[PDB]
Amino acid sequence: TFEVDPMDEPTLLYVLFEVFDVVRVHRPHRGVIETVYLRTPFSAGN
Amino acid sequence: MMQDATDPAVRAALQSQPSGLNSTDDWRQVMDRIMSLTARNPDAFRQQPQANRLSAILEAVVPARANPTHEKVLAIVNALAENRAIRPDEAGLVYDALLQRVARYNSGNVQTNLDRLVGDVREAVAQRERAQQQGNLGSMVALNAFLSTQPANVPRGQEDYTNFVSALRLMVTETPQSEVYQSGPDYFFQTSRQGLQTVNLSQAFKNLQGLWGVRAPTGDRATVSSLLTPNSRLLLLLIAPFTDSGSVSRDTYLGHLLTLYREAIGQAHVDEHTFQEITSVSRALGQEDTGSLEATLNYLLTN
């Protein structure tokens, strides 16, 4: 239930939800990278 | 107390597998820790934050398969570094060249051998490390070539040399470390120290084959025995802390000089205990006492 001071110009109310996105840099072989990312509070990960 | 060469299968494990808590491998250690059964403090799992508390439960109650290959293949390649099958800078190639080899052959009977070979190669480090302390292995085989090529038991002048046969064999058995009977040139030669400051020829010893039994003058260096080369003289002083009684001390210098080689050692260890005291007493003298060495010279010359 947002409320702002009177609007005049068309503006986007930029709202951030504090999410959590982390990597991990794998190297089983020299030269070969195994990639896995995870944004958890946004249904993302693995 | 000291250790053997830092276990080669464990050095590579040290650098790969988890340290504190491997929840699958140390399962009944984590399970003991989470059940409040640990004797240090029981409720160390209760007072911890709730989220990492749950991370210990999910991982221990359901054991998760952790990767074992990279602590098994590296266990070979780091043993290859300790057994010196590869150079230390070669750890980038052979680690992955065999990993690329098992990438092609992950799944034959070969890797079932590999882990049995892991226990074999790690033992080969421990076998050789105890074997390099006794450098007899690259010495006795070399002496076998010396005994075969050199004509054995032929003193038809006079025989005192039968005792000398064992005297060279005693040098292999007593001191083994740096004592390598190297066969570089065709003449055999023995090194005594790690840096080889008395490595004379055992074929300069071929000068003694005519001098195995000659007449003795009197007690001063002989009228004949000046022929004995400082090369062979270096060998006979080196066998002197090994064999003394056996060779006739009254018939030729094989024995008379060998007893006199003990006179050189006999003065040396006395003067060693003499020098370790006068140098130690430098607070009350306050000078560069070369008289410690001048008395050593006087105790050898004026006799």
3-state secondary structure of B67: coil
Ranges of each domain in chain B: 1-134, 138-303
Nearest CA to B189 out of B235, B223, B229, B148 is that of B235
Tell me the chain A residues in contact with residue B100 when contact means C-beta distances shorter than 8 Å. 29
Q: Do B70 and A28 touch (CB under 8 A)?
A: yes
Separation CA B177–CA B191 (nearest Å): 10
Q: Do A30 and B92 touch (CB under 8 A)?
A: yes
Residue carrying structure tokens 């010279």: B297
- Indicate the DSSP class of residue B166: H
Cα A25 off chain centre by: 18
Separation CA B160–CA B255 (nearest Å): 8
Separation CA A25–CA B170 (nearest Å): 60
Cα A17 off chain centre by: 9
Element (H, E) at A27: strand A26-29
Q: Do B100 and A29 touch (CB under 8 A)?
A: yes
Q: Take residue B182 and report the two structure tokens written for it.
A: 């190297």
Q: Take residue B204 and report the two structure tokens written for it.
A: 């300069």
Is the Cα dihedral B64, B70, B73, B78 positive or negative? negative
CA distance A16 to chain B (A): 24
CA distances from B237 to B32, B89, B232, B259 (A): 67, 43, 9, 10
Q: Do B92 and A28 touch (CB under 8 A)?
A: no
Number of helices followed by number of strands (H, E) in chain B: 11, 0
CA distance A28 to chain B (A): 8
Q: How far apart are the first and last CA of chain A?
A: 34
Tell me the chain A residues in contact with residue B99 when contact means C-beta distances shorter than 8 Å. 28-29
Give B65: exposed, middle or buried? Use CB within 10 Å, 0-12, 13-18, 19+: exposed
Long-range pairs, B132-135, Cβ under 8 A, ≥24: B133/B176, B133/B177, B134/B176, B134/B177, B135/B176, B135/B177, B135/B178, B135/B179, B135/B180
Experimental determination technique = X-ray
Long-range pairs, B88-97, Cβ under 8 A, ≥24: B92/A30, B95/A30, B96/A29, B96/A30
3-state secondary structure of B175: coil
Tell the CATH topology of B1-134. Answer: Four Helix Bundle (Hemerythrin (Met), subunit A) (1.20.120)
Residues 26-45 of A with CB under 8 A from B: 28-30
Contact predicate B190/B142, CB 8 Å: no
Torsion-angle region of B270 (φ positive above 0: left; ψ -120 to 50: alpha; else: beta) = alpha
CA distances from A39 to A22, A26, A31 (A): 7, 18, 26
DSSP string, B212-232: SS----SSSS-SSGGGS-HHH
CA distances from B188 to B11, B167, B199, B228, B237 (A): 40, 16, 10, 18, 17
